Amino acid sequence: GSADEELEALRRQRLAELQAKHGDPGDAAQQEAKHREAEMRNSILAQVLDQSARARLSNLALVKPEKTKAVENYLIQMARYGQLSEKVSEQGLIEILKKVSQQTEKTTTVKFN
């Protein structure tokens, strides 16, 4: 088993270990870095919030992005708990949104953004 994989690995090893750099540690790398910042946040949100929840989040950002910022942040926290076996549905996002509407997410812990 995995013979084709380990075979391909030898070829890929030459490719991977080579490490194609672009020469400079700037410009594209800066945008790349910033993209990775978003990517990590976007990926967890896209996996935790299903399509429906994203669409609702988008419309929420349309009406008042202030709270969007709070719930986006909140979902990042919730995702960091690794408790998302299931998708957060629209109703779930709305339940969260309800408690965060004024301000109820500032827990006594230093949470990241």
PDB file of N, CA and C in Angstrom:
ATOM      1  N   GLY A   1       0.826  -1.206   0.000  1.00  0.00           N
ATOM      2  CA  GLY A   1       0.000   0.000   0.000  1.00  0.00           C
ATOM      3  C   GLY A   1       0.848   1.239   0.000  1.00  0.00           C
ATOM      4  N   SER A   2       0.284   2.344  -0.494  1.00  0.00           N
ATOM      5  CA  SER A   2       0.936   3.661  -0.566  1.00  0.00           C
ATOM      6  C   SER A   2       2.222   3.638  -1.412  1.00  0.00           C
ATOM      7  N   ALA A   3       2.343   2.642  -2.276  1.00  0.00           N
ATOM      8  CA  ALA A   3       3.543   2.460  -3.068  1.00  0.00           C
ATOM      9  C   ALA A   3       3.637   3.519  -4.145  1.00  0.00           C
ATOM     10  N   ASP A   4       2.500   3.850  -4.733  1.00  0.00           N
ATOM     11  CA  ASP A   4       2.433   4.846  -5.786  1.00  0.00           C
ATOM     12  C   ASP A   4       2.703   6.211  -5.191  1.00  0.00           C
ATOM     13  N   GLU A   5       2.239   6.387  -3.967  1.00  0.00           N
ATOM     14  CA  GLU A   5       2.387   7.621  -3.240  1.00  0.00           C
ATOM     15  C   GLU A   5       3.851   7.835  -2.874  1.00  0.00           C
ATOM     16  N   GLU A   6       4.479   6.813  -2.302  1.00  0.00           N
ATOM     17  CA  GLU A   6       5.885   6.884  -1.923  1.00  0.00           C
ATOM     18  C   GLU A   6       6.799   6.961  -3.140  1.00  0.00           C
ATOM     19  N   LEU A   7       6.350   6.405  -4.244  1.00  0.00           N
ATOM     20  CA  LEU A   7       7.079   6.497  -5.491  1.00  0.00           C
ATOM     21  C   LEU A   7       7.054   7.941  -5.981  1.00  0.00           C
ATOM     22  N   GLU A   8       5.865   8.527  -5.975  1.00  0.00           N
ATOM     23  CA  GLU A   8       5.659   9.892  -6.424  1.00  0.00           C
ATOM     24  C   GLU A   8       6.384  10.853  -5.477  1.00  0.00           C
ATOM     25  N   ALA A   9       6.483  10.442  -4.220  1.00  0.00           N
ATOM     26  CA  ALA A   9       7.160  11.193  -3.179  1.00  0.00           C
ATOM     27  C   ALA A   9       8.608  11.471  -3.537  1.00  0.00           C
ATOM     28  N   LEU A  10       9.269  10.528  -4.197  1.00  0.00           N
ATOM     29  CA  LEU A  10      10.662  10.699  -4.583  1.00  0.00           C
ATOM     30  C   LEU A  10      10.829  11.824  -5.589  1.00  0.00           C
ATOM     31  N   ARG A  11       9.893  11.905  -6.495  1.00  0.00           N
ATOM     32  CA  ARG A  11       9.853  12.935  -7.511  1.00  0.00           C
ATOM     33  C   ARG A  11       9.500  14.276  -6.868  1.00  0.00           C
ATOM     34  N   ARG A  12       8.471  14.249  -6.054  1.00  0.00           N
ATOM     35  CA  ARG A  12       7.996  15.425  -5.346  1.00  0.00           C
ATOM     36  C   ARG A  12       9.001  15.943  -4.346  1.00  0.00           C
ATOM     37  N   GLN A  13       9.811  15.060  -3.802  1.00  0.00           N
ATOM     38  CA  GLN A  13      10.841  15.443  -2.864  1.00  0.00           C
ATOM     39  C   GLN A  13      11.814  16.396  -3.534  1.00  0.00           C
ATOM     40  N   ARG A  14      12.258  16.051  -4.741  1.00  0.00           N
ATOM     41  CA  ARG A  14      13.160  16.939  -5.517  1.00  0.00           C
ATOM     42  C   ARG A  14      12.537  18.308  -5.741  1.00  0.00           C
ATOM     43  N   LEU A  15      11.243  18.309  -5.940  1.00  0.00           N
ATOM     44  CA  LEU A  15      10.476  19.509  -6.181  1.00  0.00           C
ATOM     45  C   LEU A  15      10.345  20.328  -4.881  1.00  0.00           C
ATOM     46  N   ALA A  16       9.983  19.658  -3.801  1.00  0.00           N
ATOM     47  CA  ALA A  16       9.661  20.309  -2.553  1.00  0.00           C
ATOM     48  C   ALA A  16      10.895  20.822  -1.858  1.00  0.00           C
ATOM     49  N   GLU A  17      11.911  19.988  -1.811  1.00  0.00           N
ATOM     50  CA  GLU A  17      13.145  20.293  -1.111  1.00  0.00           C
ATOM     51  C   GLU A  17      13.942  21.371  -1.821  1.00  0.00           C
ATOM     52  N   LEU A  18      13.703  21.515  -3.123  1.00  0.00           N
ATOM     53  CA  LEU A  18      14.345  22.546  -3.945  1.00  0.00           C
ATOM     54  C   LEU A  18      14.033  23.901  -3.325  1.00  0.00           C
ATOM     55  N   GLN A  19      12.748  24.086  -3.034  1.00  0.00           N
ATOM     56  CA  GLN A  19      12.199  25.303  -2.485  1.00  0.00           C
ATOM     57  C   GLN A  19      12.334  26.453  -3.446  1.00  0.00           C
ATOM     58  N   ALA A  20      11.342  26.602  -4.272  1.00  0.00           N
ATOM     59  CA  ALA A  20      11.281  27.703  -5.198  1.00  0.00           C
ATOM     60  C   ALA A  20      10.984  29.008  -4.464  1.00  0.00           C
ATOM     61  N   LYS A  21      11.980  29.852  -4.373  1.00  0.00           N
ATOM     62  CA  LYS A  21      11.830  31.173  -3.824  1.00  0.00           C
ATOM     63  C   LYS A  21      11.617  32.123  -4.975  1.00  0.00           C
ATOM     64  N   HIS A  22      11.186  33.319  -4.682  1.00  0.00           N
ATOM     65  CA  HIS A  22      11.049  34.339  -5.707  1.00  0.00           C
ATOM     66  C   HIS A  22      12.201  35.315  -5.661  1.00  0.00           C
ATOM     67  N   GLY A  23      13.051  35.149  -4.664  1.00  0.00           N
ATOM     68  CA  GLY A  23      14.278  35.897  -4.582  1.00  0.00           C
ATOM     69  C   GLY A  23      14.208  36.969  -3.549  1.00  0.00           C
ATOM     70  N   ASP A  24      13.090  37.605  -3.489  1.00  0.00           N
ATOM     71  CA  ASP A  24      12.880  38.702  -2.592  1.00  0.00           C
ATOM     72  C   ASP A  24      11.907  38.285  -1.498  1.00  0.00           C
ATOM     73  N   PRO A  25      12.017  38.852  -0.302  1.00  0.00           N
ATOM     74  CA  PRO A  25      11.107  38.574   0.788  1.00  0.00           C
ATOM     75  C   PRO A  25      10.062  39.689   0.952  1.00  0.00           C
ATOM     76  N   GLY A  26       9.702  40.320  -0.144  1.00  0.00           N
ATOM     77  CA  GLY A  26       8.761  41.391  -0.084  1.00  0.00           C
ATOM     78  C   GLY A  26       7.745  41.301  -1.178  1.00  0.00           C
ATOM     79  N   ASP A  27       7.086  42.428  -1.438  1.00  0.00           N
ATOM     80  CA  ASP A  27       6.077  42.614  -2.499  1.00  0.00           C
ATOM     81  C   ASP A  27       5.006  41.515  -2.517  1.00  0.00           C
ATOM     82  N   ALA A  28       5.238  40.461  -3.278  1.00  0.00           N
ATOM     83  CA  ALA A  28       4.299  39.368  -3.389  1.00  0.00           C
ATOM     84  C   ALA A  28       4.194  38.616  -2.075  1.00  0.00           C
ATOM     85  N   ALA A  29       5.290  38.592  -1.332  1.00  0.00           N
ATOM     86  CA  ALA A  29       5.351  37.895  -0.061  1.00  0.00           C
ATOM     87  C   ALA A  29       4.543  38.630   0.997  1.00  0.00           C
ATOM     88  N   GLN A  30       4.434  39.936   0.836  1.00  0.00           N
ATOM     89  CA  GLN A  30       3.703  40.767   1.773  1.00  0.00           C
ATOM     90  C   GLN A  30       2.215  40.539   1.592  1.00  0.00           C
ATOM     91  N   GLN A  31       1.807  40.496   0.337  1.00  0.00           N
ATOM     92  CA  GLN A  31       0.430  40.236  -0.015  1.00  0.00           C
ATOM     93  C   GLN A  31       0.087  38.797   0.355  1.00  0.00           C
ATOM     94  N   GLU A  32       1.045  37.904   0.135  1.00  0.00           N
ATOM     95  CA  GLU A  32       0.909  36.505   0.495  1.00  0.00           C
ATOM     96  C   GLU A  32       0.653  36.376   1.989  1.00  0.00           C
ATOM     97  N   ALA A  33       1.496  37.028   2.779  1.00  0.00           N
ATOM     98  CA  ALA A  33       1.388  37.015   4.228  1.00  0.00           C
ATOM     99  C   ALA A  33       0.022  37.501   4.679  1.00  0.00           C
ATOM    100  N   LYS A  34      -0.421  38.597   4.096  1.00  0.00           N
ATOM    101  CA  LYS A  34      -1.711  39.182   4.415  1.00  0.00           C
ATOM    102  C   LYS A  34      -2.849  38.242   3.981  1.00  0.00           C
ATOM    103  N   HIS A  35      -2.660  37.592   2.850  1.00  0.00           N
ATOM    104  CA  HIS A  35      -3.608  36.619   2.351  1.00  0.00           C
ATOM    105  C   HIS A  35      -3.700  35.444   3.317  1.00  0.00           C
ATOM    106  N   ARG A  36      -2.570  35.002   3.858  1.00  0.00           N
ATOM    107  CA  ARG A  36      -2.580  33.888   4.808  1.00  0.00           C
ATOM    108  C   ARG A  36      -3.295  34.282   6.101  1.00  0.00           C
ATOM    109  N   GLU A  37      -3.213  35.574   6.459  1.00  0.00           N
ATOM    110  CA  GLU A  37      -3.899  36.088   7.641  1.00  0.00           C
ATOM    111  C   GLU A  37      -5.401  35.926   7.473  1.00  0.00           C
ATOM    112  N   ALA A  38      -5.876  36.297   6.311  1.00  0.00           N
ATOM    113  CA  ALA A  38      -7.271  36.198   5.992  1.00  0.00           C
ATOM    114  C   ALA A  38      -7.665  34.759   5.790  1.00  0.00           C
ATOM    115  N   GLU A  39      -6.803  34.010   5.126  1.00  0.00           N
ATOM    116  CA  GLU A  39      -7.043  32.616   4.776  1.00  0.00           C
ATOM    117  C   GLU A  39      -7.351  31.778   6.013  1.00  0.00           C
ATOM    118  N   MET A  40      -6.573  31.961   7.066  1.00  0.00           N
ATOM    119  CA  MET A  40      -6.776  31.190   8.295  1.00  0.00           C
ATOM    120  C   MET A  40      -8.121  31.527   8.947  1.00  0.00           C
ATOM    121  N   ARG A  41      -8.499  32.793   8.895  1.00  0.00           N
ATOM    122  CA  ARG A  41      -9.761  33.234   9.458  1.00  0.00           C
ATOM    123  C   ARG A  41     -10.924  32.804   8.556  1.00  0.00           C
ATOM    124  N   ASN A  42     -10.728  32.958   7.263  1.00  0.00           N
ATOM    125  CA  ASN A  42     -11.726  32.630   6.246  1.00  0.00           C
ATOM    126  C   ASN A  42     -12.024  31.139   6.218  1.00  0.00           C
ATOM    127  N   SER A  43     -10.983  30.315   6.277  1.00  0.00           N
ATOM    128  CA  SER A  43     -11.153  28.873   6.230  1.00  0.00           C
ATOM    129  C   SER A  43     -11.969  28.351   7.403  1.00  0.00           C
ATOM    130  N   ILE A  44     -11.649  28.788   8.623  1.00  0.00           N
ATOM    131  CA  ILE A  44     -12.398  28.329   9.779  1.00  0.00           C
ATOM    132  C   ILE A  44     -13.847  28.803   9.706  1.00  0.00           C
ATOM    133  N   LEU A  45     -14.054  30.033   9.267  1.00  0.00           N
ATOM    134  CA  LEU A  45     -15.398  30.572   9.135  1.00  0.00           C
ATOM    135  C   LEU A  45     -16.183  29.853   8.041  1.00  0.00           C
ATOM    136  N   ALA A  46     -15.518  29.486   6.965  1.00  0.00           N
ATOM    137  CA  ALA A  46     -16.174  28.818   5.847  1.00  0.00           C
ATOM    138  C   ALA A  46     -16.507  27.362   6.171  1.00  0.00           C
ATOM    139  N   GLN A  47     -15.812  26.802   7.132  1.00  0.00           N
ATOM    140  CA  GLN A  47     -16.048  25.424   7.527  1.00  0.00           C
ATOM    141  C   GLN A  47     -17.022  25.345   8.691  1.00  0.00           C
ATOM    142  N   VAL A  48     -17.015  26.364   9.512  1.00  0.00           N
ATOM    143  CA  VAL A  48     -17.888  26.451  10.674  1.00  0.00           C
ATOM    144  C   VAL A  48     -19.233  27.014  10.303  1.00  0.00           C
ATOM    145  N   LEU A  49     -19.229  28.054   9.556  1.00  0.00           N
ATOM    146  CA  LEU A  49     -20.439  28.616   9.089  1.00  0.00           C
ATOM    147  C   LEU A  49     -20.696  27.990   7.772  1.00  0.00           C
ATOM    148  N   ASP A  50     -21.852  27.478   7.574  1.00  0.00           N
ATOM    149  CA  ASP A  50     -22.133  26.941   6.277  1.00  0.00           C
ATOM    150  C   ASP A  50     -22.508  28.086   5.318  1.00  0.00           C
ATOM    151  N   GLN A  51     -22.834  27.759   4.085  1.00  0.00           N
ATOM    152  CA  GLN A  51     -23.096  28.739   3.028  1.00  0.00           C
ATOM    153  C   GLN A  51     -24.188  29.717   3.411  1.00  0.00           C
ATOM    154  N   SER A  52     -25.185  29.193   4.062  1.00  0.00           N
ATOM    155  CA  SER A  52     -26.349  29.928   4.468  1.00  0.00           C
ATOM    156  C   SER A  52     -25.974  30.985   5.495  1.00  0.00           C
ATOM    157  N   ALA A  53     -25.129  30.585   6.417  1.00  0.00           N
ATOM    158  CA  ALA A  53     -24.670  31.449   7.458  1.00  0.00           C
ATOM    159  C   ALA A  53     -23.770  32.540   6.888  1.00  0.00           C
ATOM    160  N   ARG A  54     -22.927  32.197   5.897  1.00  0.00           N
ATOM    161  CA  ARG A  54     -22.103  33.227   5.245  1.00  0.00           C
ATOM    162  C   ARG A  54     -22.955  34.245   4.526  1.00  0.00           C
ATOM    163  N   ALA A  55     -23.974  33.778   3.824  1.00  0.00           N
ATOM    164  CA  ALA A  55     -24.880  34.664   3.101  1.00  0.00           C
ATOM    165  C   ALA A  55     -25.591  35.615   4.067  1.00  0.00           C
ATOM    166  N   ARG A  56     -25.966  35.092   5.221  1.00  0.00           N
ATOM    167  CA  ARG A  56     -26.625  35.878   6.227  1.00  0.00           C
ATOM    168  C   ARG A  56     -25.631  36.867   6.848  1.00  0.00           C
ATOM    169  N   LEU A  57     -24.397  36.414   7.021  1.00  0.00           N
ATOM    170  CA  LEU A  57     -23.315  37.232   7.559  1.00  0.00           C
ATOM    171  C   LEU A  57     -23.019  38.401   6.610  1.00  0.00           C
ATOM    172  N   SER A  58     -23.042  38.121   5.312  1.00  0.00           N
ATOM    173  CA  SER A  58     -22.835  39.124   4.290  1.00  0.00           C
ATOM    174  C   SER A  58     -23.914  40.219   4.377  1.00  0.00           C
ATOM    175  N   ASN A  59     -25.169  39.801   4.484  1.00  0.00           N
ATOM    176  CA  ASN A  59     -26.290  40.750   4.603  1.00  0.00           C
ATOM    177  C   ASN A  59     -26.209  41.503   5.937  1.00  0.00           C
ATOM    178  N   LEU A  60     -25.642  40.853   6.940  1.00  0.00           N
ATOM    179  CA  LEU A  60     -25.476  41.458   8.253  1.00  0.00           C
ATOM    180  C   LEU A  60     -24.417  42.563   8.150  1.00  0.00           C
ATOM    181  N   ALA A  61     -23.375  42.287   7.388  1.00  0.00           N
ATOM    182  CA  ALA A  61     -22.304  43.253   7.141  1.00  0.00           C
ATOM    183  C   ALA A  61     -22.830  44.438   6.343  1.00  0.00           C
ATOM    184  N   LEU A  62     -23.841  44.171   5.543  1.00  0.00           N
ATOM    185  CA  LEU A  62     -24.491  45.167   4.738  1.00  0.00           C
ATOM    186  C   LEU A  62     -25.286  46.126   5.627  1.00  0.00           C
ATOM    187  N   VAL A  63     -26.000  45.582   6.602  1.00  0.00           N
ATOM    188  CA  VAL A  63     -26.810  46.407   7.477  1.00  0.00           C
ATOM    189  C   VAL A  63     -25.979  47.143   8.543  1.00  0.00           C
ATOM    190  N   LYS A  64     -25.150  46.417   9.282  1.00  0.00           N
ATOM    191  CA  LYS A  64     -24.310  47.014  10.298  1.00  0.00           C
ATOM    192  C   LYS A  64     -23.069  46.160  10.574  1.00  0.00           C
ATOM    193  N   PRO A  65     -21.946  46.481   9.894  1.00  0.00           N
ATOM    194  CA  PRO A  65     -20.705  45.712   9.991  1.00  0.00           C
ATOM    195  C   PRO A  65     -20.096  45.687  11.397  1.00  0.00           C
ATOM    196  N   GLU A  66     -20.522  46.613  12.265  1.00  0.00           N
ATOM    197  CA  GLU A  66     -20.044  46.687  13.655  1.00  0.00           C
ATOM    198  C   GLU A  66     -20.244  45.351  14.337  1.00  0.00           C
ATOM    199  N   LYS A  67     -21.444  44.829  14.207  1.00  0.00           N
ATOM    200  CA  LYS A  67     -21.787  43.605  14.880  1.00  0.00           C
ATOM    201  C   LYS A  67     -21.231  42.419  14.154  1.00  0.00           C
ATOM    202  N   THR A  68     -21.081  42.560  12.840  1.00  0.00           N
ATOM    203  CA  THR A  68     -20.455  41.550  12.024  1.00  0.00           C
ATOM    204  C   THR A  68     -19.056  41.270  12.581  1.00  0.00           C
ATOM    205  N   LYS A  69     -18.323  42.345  12.874  1.00  0.00           N
ATOM    206  CA  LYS A  69     -16.973  42.270  13.431  1.00  0.00           C
ATOM    207  C   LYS A  69     -16.956  41.481  14.734  1.00  0.00           C
ATOM    208  N   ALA A  70     -17.977  41.680  15.555  1.00  0.00           N
ATOM    209  CA  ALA A  70     -18.072  41.004  16.813  1.00  0.00           C
ATOM    210  C   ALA A  70     -18.376  39.522  16.613  1.00  0.00           C
ATOM    211  N   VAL A  71     -19.333  39.214  15.738  1.00  0.00           N
ATOM    212  CA  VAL A  71     -19.698  37.823  15.507  1.00  0.00           C
ATOM    213  C   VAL A  71     -18.627  37.059  14.722  1.00  0.00           C
ATOM    214  N   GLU A  72     -17.951  37.727  13.774  1.00  0.00           N
ATOM    215  CA  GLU A  72     -16.840  37.107  13.041  1.00  0.00           C
ATOM    216  C   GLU A  72     -15.769  36.697  14.036  1.00  0.00           C
ATOM    217  N   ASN A  73     -15.436  37.627  14.931  1.00  0.00           N
ATOM    218  CA  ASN A  73     -14.478  37.400  15.985  1.00  0.00           C
ATOM    219  C   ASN A  73     -14.941  36.272  16.894  1.00  0.00           C
ATOM    220  N   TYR A  74     -16.223  36.292  17.242  1.00  0.00           N
ATOM    221  CA  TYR A  74     -16.800  35.304  18.125  1.00  0.00           C
ATOM    222  C   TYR A  74     -16.706  33.899  17.530  1.00  0.00           C
ATOM    223  N   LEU A  75     -17.042  33.775  16.258  1.00  0.00           N
ATOM    224  CA  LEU A  75     -16.955  32.497  15.570  1.00  0.00           C
ATOM    225  C   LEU A  75     -15.530  31.985  15.509  1.00  0.00           C
ATOM    226  N   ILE A  76     -14.570  32.889  15.323  1.00  0.00           N
ATOM    227  CA  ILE A  76     -13.147  32.526  15.353  1.00  0.00           C
ATOM    228  C   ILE A  76     -12.801  31.883  16.715  1.00  0.00           C
ATOM    229  N   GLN A  77     -13.365  32.441  17.789  1.00  0.00           N
ATOM    230  CA  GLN A  77     -13.137  31.927  19.140  1.00  0.00           C
ATOM    231  C   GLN A  77     -13.740  30.549  19.256  1.00  0.00           C
ATOM    232  N   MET A  78     -14.989  30.448  18.844  1.00  0.00           N
ATOM    233  CA  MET A  78     -15.753  29.214  18.916  1.00  0.00           C
ATOM    234  C   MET A  78     -15.085  28.118  18.069  1.00  0.00           C
ATOM    235  N   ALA A  79     -14.549  28.516  16.923  1.00  0.00           N
ATOM    236  CA  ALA A  79     -13.814  27.615  16.044  1.00  0.00           C
ATOM    237  C   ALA A  79     -12.512  27.165  16.690  1.00  0.00           C
ATOM    238  N   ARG A  80     -11.925  28.037  17.500  1.00  0.00           N
ATOM    239  CA  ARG A  80     -10.677  27.742  18.195  1.00  0.00           C
ATOM    240  C   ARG A  80     -10.920  26.702  19.307  1.00  0.00           C
ATOM    241  N   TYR A  81     -12.172  26.551  19.714  1.00  0.00           N
ATOM    242  CA  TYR A  81     -12.539  25.526  20.687  1.00  0.00           C
ATOM    243  C   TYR A  81     -12.614  24.150  20.029  1.00  0.00           C
ATOM    244  N   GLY A  82     -12.712  24.138  18.702  1.00  0.00           N
ATOM    245  CA  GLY A  82     -12.768  22.894  17.959  1.00  0.00           C
ATOM    246  C   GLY A  82     -14.062  22.152  18.200  1.00  0.00           C
ATOM    247  N   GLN A  83     -15.092  22.891  18.555  1.00  0.00           N
ATOM    248  CA  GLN A  83     -16.364  22.294  18.934  1.00  0.00           C
ATOM    249  C   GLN A  83     -17.306  22.169  17.749  1.00  0.00           C
ATOM    250  N   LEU A  84     -16.845  22.511  16.576  1.00  0.00           N
ATOM    251  CA  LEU A  84     -17.721  22.490  15.444  1.00  0.00           C
ATOM    252  C   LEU A  84     -17.632  21.213  14.694  1.00  0.00           C
ATOM    253  N   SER A  85     -18.461  20.316  15.078  1.00  0.00           N
ATOM    254  CA  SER A  85     -18.615  19.096  14.389  1.00  0.00           C
ATOM    255  C   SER A  85     -19.638  19.354  13.281  1.00  0.00           C
ATOM    256  N   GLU A  86     -20.678  20.075  13.650  1.00  0.00           N
ATOM    257  CA  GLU A  86     -21.703  20.478  12.730  1.00  0.00           C
ATOM    258  C   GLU A  86     -21.522  21.927  12.351  1.00  0.00           C
ATOM    259  N   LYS A  87     -22.195  22.314  11.304  1.00  0.00           N
ATOM    260  CA  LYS A  87     -22.171  23.662  10.800  1.00  0.00           C
ATOM    261  C   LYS A  87     -23.019  24.544  11.678  1.00  0.00           C
ATOM    262  N   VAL A  88     -22.589  25.755  11.859  1.00  0.00           N
ATOM    263  CA  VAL A  88     -23.393  26.725  12.517  1.00  0.00           C
ATOM    264  C   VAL A  88     -24.393  27.217  11.497  1.00  0.00           C
ATOM    265  N   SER A  89     -25.624  26.966  11.780  1.00  0.00           N
ATOM    266  CA  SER A  89     -26.697  27.292  10.919  1.00  0.00           C
ATOM    267  C   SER A  89     -27.063  28.770  11.066  1.00  0.00           C
ATOM    268  N   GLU A  90     -27.974  29.239  10.228  1.00  0.00           N
ATOM    269  CA  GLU A  90     -28.413  30.620  10.263  1.00  0.00           C
ATOM    270  C   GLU A  90     -29.001  30.949  11.609  1.00  0.00           C
ATOM    271  N   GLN A  91     -29.861  30.064  12.108  1.00  0.00           N
ATOM    272  CA  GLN A  91     -30.499  30.264  13.396  1.00  0.00           C
ATOM    273  C   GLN A  91     -29.453  30.349  14.507  1.00  0.00           C
ATOM    274  N   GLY A  92     -28.378  29.574  14.367  1.00  0.00           N
ATOM    275  CA  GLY A  92     -27.320  29.567  15.349  1.00  0.00           C
ATOM    276  C   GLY A  92     -26.569  30.869  15.343  1.00  0.00           C
ATOM    277  N   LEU A  93     -26.242  31.337  14.147  1.00  0.00           N
ATOM    278  CA  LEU A  93     -25.554  32.605  13.967  1.00  0.00           C
ATOM    279  C   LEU A  93     -26.407  33.738  14.529  1.00  0.00           C
ATOM    280  N   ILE A  94     -27.709  33.650  14.303  1.00  0.00           N
ATOM    281  CA  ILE A  94     -28.647  34.635  14.797  1.00  0.00           C
ATOM    282  C   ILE A  94     -28.739  34.585  16.334  1.00  0.00           C
ATOM    283  N   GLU A  95     -28.676  33.380  16.925  1.00  0.00           N
ATOM    284  CA  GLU A  95     -28.689  33.250  18.392  1.00  0.00           C
ATOM    285  C   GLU A  95     -27.475  33.937  18.980  1.00  0.00           C
ATOM    286  N   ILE A  96     -26.334  33.709  18.358  1.00  0.00           N
ATOM    287  CA  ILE A  96     -25.099  34.344  18.753  1.00  0.00           C
ATOM    288  C   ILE A  96     -25.232  35.857  18.603  1.00  0.00           C
ATOM    289  N   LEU A  97     -25.678  36.281  17.426  1.00  0.00           N
ATOM    290  CA  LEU A  97     -25.879  37.691  17.083  1.00  0.00           C
ATOM    291  C   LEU A  97     -26.734  38.403  18.134  1.00  0.00           C
ATOM    292  N   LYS A  98     -27.747  37.704  18.634  1.00  0.00           N
ATOM    293  CA  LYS A  98     -28.625  38.234  19.669  1.00  0.00           C
ATOM    294  C   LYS A  98     -27.850  38.611  20.924  1.00  0.00           C
ATOM    295  N   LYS A  99     -26.994  37.724  21.397  1.00  0.00           N
ATOM    296  CA  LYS A  99     -26.292  37.998  22.612  1.00  0.00           C
ATOM    297  C   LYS A  99     -25.175  39.017  22.430  1.00  0.00           C
ATOM    298  N   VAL A 100     -24.681  39.142  21.210  1.00  0.00           N
ATOM    299  CA  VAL A 100     -23.566  40.035  20.950  1.00  0.00           C
ATOM    300  C   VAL A 100     -24.062  41.432  20.492  1.00  0.00           C
ATOM    301  N   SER A 101     -25.380  41.562  20.252  1.00  0.00           N
ATOM    302  CA  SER A 101     -26.020  42.776  19.710  1.00  0.00           C
ATOM    303  C   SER A 101     -25.579  44.082  20.401  1.00  0.00           C
ATOM    304  N   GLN A 102     -25.527  44.083  21.710  1.00  0.00           N
ATOM    305  CA  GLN A 102     -24.996  45.218  22.415  1.00  0.00           C
ATOM    306  C   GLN A 102     -23.522  44.941  22.638  1.00  0.00           C
ATOM    307  N   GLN A 103     -23.250  44.008  23.536  1.00  0.00           N
ATOM    308  CA  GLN A 103     -21.915  43.522  23.825  1.00  0.00           C
ATOM    309  C   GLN A 103     -21.956  42.409  24.851  1.00  0.00           C
ATOM    310  N   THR A 104     -21.774  41.216  24.392  1.00  0.00           N
ATOM    311  CA  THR A 104     -21.666  40.071  25.246  1.00  0.00           C
ATOM    312  C   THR A 104     -20.809  39.028  24.561  1.00  0.00           C
ATOM    313  N   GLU A 105     -19.525  39.252  24.647  1.00  0.00           N
ATOM    314  CA  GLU A 105     -18.520  38.352  24.117  1.00  0.00           C
ATOM    315  C   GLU A 105     -17.170  38.611  24.753  1.00  0.00           C
ATOM    316  N   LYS A 106     -17.078  39.702  25.494  1.00  0.00           N
ATOM    317  CA  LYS A 106     -15.866  40.074  26.146  1.00  0.00           C
ATOM    318  C   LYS A 106     -15.765  39.253  27.417  1.00  0.00           C
ATOM    319  N   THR A 107     -15.178  38.114  27.282  1.00  0.00           N
ATOM    320  CA  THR A 107     -14.986  37.238  28.378  1.00  0.00           C
ATOM    321  C   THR A 107     -13.655  37.591  29.040  1.00  0.00           C
ATOM    322  N   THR A 108     -13.498  37.243  30.289  1.00  0.00           N
ATOM    323  CA  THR A 108     -12.289  37.534  31.001  1.00  0.00           C
ATOM    324  C   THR A 108     -11.196  36.512  30.629  1.00  0.00           C
ATOM    325  N   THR A 109     -10.651  36.718  29.454  1.00  0.00           N
ATOM    326  CA  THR A 109      -9.601  35.946  28.847  1.00  0.00           C
ATOM    327  C   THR A 109      -9.079  36.805  27.692  1.00  0.00           C
ATOM    328  N   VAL A 110      -7.805  36.742  27.407  1.00  0.00           N
ATOM    329  CA  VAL A 110      -7.276  37.483  26.290  1.00  0.00           C
ATOM    330  C   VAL A 110      -7.489  36.709  24.987  1.00  0.00           C
ATOM    331  N   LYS A 111      -8.547  37.048  24.296  1.00  0.00           N
ATOM    332  CA  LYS A 111      -8.859  36.392  23.059  1.00  0.00           C
ATOM    333  C   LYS A 111      -8.270  37.150  21.890  1.00  0.00           C
ATOM    334  N   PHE A 112      -7.837  36.416  20.909  1.00  0.00           N
ATOM    335  CA  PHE A 112      -7.198  36.973  19.744  1.00  0.00           C
ATOM    336  C   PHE A 112      -8.228  37.456  18.726  1.00  0.00           C
ATOM    337  N   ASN A 113      -7.753  38.186  17.752  1.00  0.00           N
ATOM    338  CA  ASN A 113      -8.575  38.763  16.707  1.00  0.00           C
ATOM    339  C   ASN A 113      -8.024  38.294  15.389  1.00  0.00           C
TER     340      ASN A 113
END
